[PDB]
Write a protein that binds this ligand. Structure first.
Ligand SMILES: [Zn+2]
Ligand SMILES: [Zn+2]
Ligand SMILES: [Zn+2]
Ligand SMILES: [Zn+2]
Ligand SMILES: [Zn+2]
Ligand SMILES: [Zn+2]
Lengths: 217, 217, 217
């Protein structure tokens, strides 16, 4: 069950790695590779260093656009489990200040560069993407990332897969605000008809609606 | 008004970028590129990431001496506005501990490596240059950098342009010590007949004398 | 007395640099270069940046396996005196949290990445090596590194040379625990018949036994 790559749009790729989570078998986690002119940028590691090193190699060897920098969408091991590989492979890593503090607390390696988007609704442009902090949801520090050329919204773990009603790992969730965070992301990026959850298949905006329903108070 | 490069001496180049500062039009900021055997070092970013990326590209493509490391002469956006570009482009950045703390406070990105020159008069050798902390002046953390082969003193923003009497952005100035800081730099580097201010043209030691006069208590 | 390289095993090299320590003449310090498939990893700097830059160049030019990352075995200038060179040359550096804190206190540059092995007996795998914190000895933060293919134990400064009875620089030593730390390292890596001290020649396990004897309460 090695790392998979699939095209989502012009210059936009999904990476997927798998980890057995007992007693439930293999759980996928998804991130993105986004091409620029002669390099690429990364959204999230995979589960560990070996999977993450495969992603770096694939961008270099298949796209011929080496990964120069990355952004991490919250402090859990599906999104930051491969930080050491990124650092050793010359990738310049970015996360929010809160994400880095939580990463250190949780035994994960922090990113090298801090983004300051602590207020709900804060948005910044990063490497041609829009990063939004929509408020706490799956994790207090969760961020979303929008690719406005193809109109692809990376919801990460804040967006649940398909029509599930399961909530996933809620150890760090903000159960009170999660549905509002989803609405905030949906309202910020109305043109994005492709939505990417971490733990399921690419879908459309129906997975924003389903997630907001199943997590609503 | 794109980034300009001009030769100051053997292996020493000035980079200049421009920013409109309302209501006064385009304001230049200057830094240096200094060649070593097969790489170069940088003094200051330009105003932003795009200008700073042009500087990195020009060293690689025109000098064939890629920028390996940089030093930043205080925590303002003319000197550190391009830090993210440097970090993404593999440049190893240096600043004093005070500069990094002020950068974080001011919303700028800190350098990756800390120099400890906190006492007035402290000097260190860095990549064949002499770095001096002459005391607070234009900004409490301002440093100067001397290139002793061509005898070029980079005064940065601590040295005002030409015969102006205007003081520039004094929000963070040490008005009591600035003239003494200028004298300290002048006495430390007597052989340097080329003096580079951030916001005006290269000149000689008369701009040390003029600055010390116009900022004197 | 320039930097020396000697083969210890398949893909494992010792680097040695020298520094005059008045009034006693030239003192060697040793570290390792360990090959991987198309890159190498480094154990310790040499005494300063120039020596450390020679090591980086030799891995690139002679092994054709550039140094990608390094580990530092405690916060003294024989092990971390070349950090600035590593950082400028693109090496991703690692040390324990305690080592980094001591480095900053002692005027050395900290590593870029923190390992958390603070409890006596903690072991981690790093780049195919086993890193062990055996407890305080030569320095409170000393770690050892084992290369299990050739069975080479890098004892660093925690292991004294040959049959000496001298203790070296004990400014930061844990004289009460040092012999137990040596025993802990010996028991953790029983198969390693090649043992490398920082300040003497490669030897066998007799230098573990001698060190434990001469430092025992
Ligand atoms: Zn999560
Ligand atoms: Zn997740
Ligand atoms: Zn300024
Ligand atoms: Zn200025
Ligand atoms: Zn030592
Ligand atoms: Zn030593």
């Amino acid at each position: 069950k090695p790392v998979e790559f699939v095209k989502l749009g012009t210059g936009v790729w999904m990476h997927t790695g798998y980890k057995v989570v007992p007693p439930w078998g293999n759980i996928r986690t998804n991130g993105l590779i986004i091409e620029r002119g002669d390099y690429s940028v990364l959204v999230d590691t995979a589960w560990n260093d070996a999977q993450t090193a495969e992603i770096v190699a694939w961008a270099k060897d298949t796209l011929q656009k080496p990964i120069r920098a990355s952004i991490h969408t919250h402090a859990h091991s599906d999104k930051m489990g491969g930080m050491d590989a990124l650092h050793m492979l010359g990738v310049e890593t970015f996360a929010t200040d809160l994400t880095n503090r939580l990463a250190i607390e949780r035994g994960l390696m922090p990113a090298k560069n801090v983004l300051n988007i602590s207020e709900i609704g804060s948005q910044i442009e990063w490497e041609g993407l829009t990063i939004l902090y929509p408020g706490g949801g799956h994790s207090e520090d969760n961020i979303v990332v929008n690719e406005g050329v193809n109109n692809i919204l990376f919801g990460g773990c804040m967006i649940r897969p398909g029509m599930t009603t399961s909530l996933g790992n809620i150890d760090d969730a903000n159960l009170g605000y999660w549905s509002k965070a989803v609405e905030n992301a949906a309202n910020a990026f109305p043109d994005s008809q492709i939505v990417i959850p971490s733990h399921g298949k690419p879908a459309g905006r129906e997975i924003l609606k389903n997630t907001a329903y199943i997590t609503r108070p």
